[PDB]
Design a protein around this ligand. Sequence first.
Ligand code: HEM
Length: 395
Amino acid sequence: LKVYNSIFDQAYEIDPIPYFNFLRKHDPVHYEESIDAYFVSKYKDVKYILKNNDIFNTKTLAKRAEPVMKDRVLAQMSGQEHKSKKKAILKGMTGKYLENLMPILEKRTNDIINKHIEKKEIDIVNDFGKVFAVQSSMDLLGINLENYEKIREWHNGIAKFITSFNLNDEEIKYSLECSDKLENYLMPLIKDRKKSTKDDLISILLEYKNDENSISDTEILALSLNVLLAATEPVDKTLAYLFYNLLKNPEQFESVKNNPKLIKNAIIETLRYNSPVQLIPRQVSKPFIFNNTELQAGDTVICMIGSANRDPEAYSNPDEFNIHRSSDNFTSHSQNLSFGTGVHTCVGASFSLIQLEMVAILLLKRLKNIKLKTMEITEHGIYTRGPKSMVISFD
Ligand code: HEM
């Protein structure tokens, strides 16, 4: 049954759209012998998978993640523990913790802007995104920006492990060395935070109680690592895509200046159009069949978020960037899956939208007469995906 189209083809990472359209039409559940996994490209099937945590569980993420996380991740948890600890993490980016974090993030943003304002250009990826994304996650958890350069050096090494399938021996040992180094840095701060309640997210995980029984320090490290990896890479890439997509559509870009309230819809449409998190794996727990494709217990299905968000069955003109989308104006609009859905849907969804709006408004207010200098982007990554560089000029 030779299927010659492959996710791992060279042309896919350059332009996955022709592969998106092919799979949804001719192979919605596509098998890749390279990693023994089926790739699900249709919106209706991805939604079904993520909303059925019993048929498609999250033990695949567990195994592949344990080496660098050192303990259990929220995705490996279920039932009361998942809810109690998810709610606990959310407390760190809501309520009073949110009101204290937001001014700091404004400062993080304005400090980056002041560094680059007098050279009349800035790289939203490499000058802002890579710096702001890691400092925001550090401010959320409660890590001092003293060592932000090395936190990034490590972070990237662990993200590679998570977002890469083919990893040789030399590449794997470095990702673990990064994990050990950051564990050596973070563990003493967890001991300090235990006695010193500074009211950050790490302190929340220490004050938490599971039937009058706090969680182990090694567990707190893994949950902190899970926040650091889940919050950094997505936020960086989304920001680059946002200003790129708007500047490539002057009408919509000017619409956003005239009505700054449209910024929330622009970010949402950006997240649908250029889904920064492209893949979500799941494990099949029992015999199941989509279309005519049979899956056996233990098979691995990989949701294709970017394809699902461009399904003609879910959106009219799905491959066009249109911030003016709405469900008021057959299935012309649907709810995208950029944050997944179901039980393991992103805890930092509301916080990501809020934080991304603050940055966009600030950039638009201080950088006057924004003009695009990177006329054509080059995107990389199939698990996490974003532009390599996105430079803009200003007065
Ligand atoms: C544009 C920004 C973001 C995007 C696109 C995104 C995407 C996602 C997606 C698709 C999932 C589902 C994973 C799965 O089903 O296995 C997820 C889960 C998660 N995200 Fe995000 N994320 C973003 C920002 C953040 C932020 C700021 C945080 C801060 C802590 C965060 C923390 C988490 C956590 C802890 C989970 C696990 C949820 C669970 O297992 O119940 N993410 N995210």
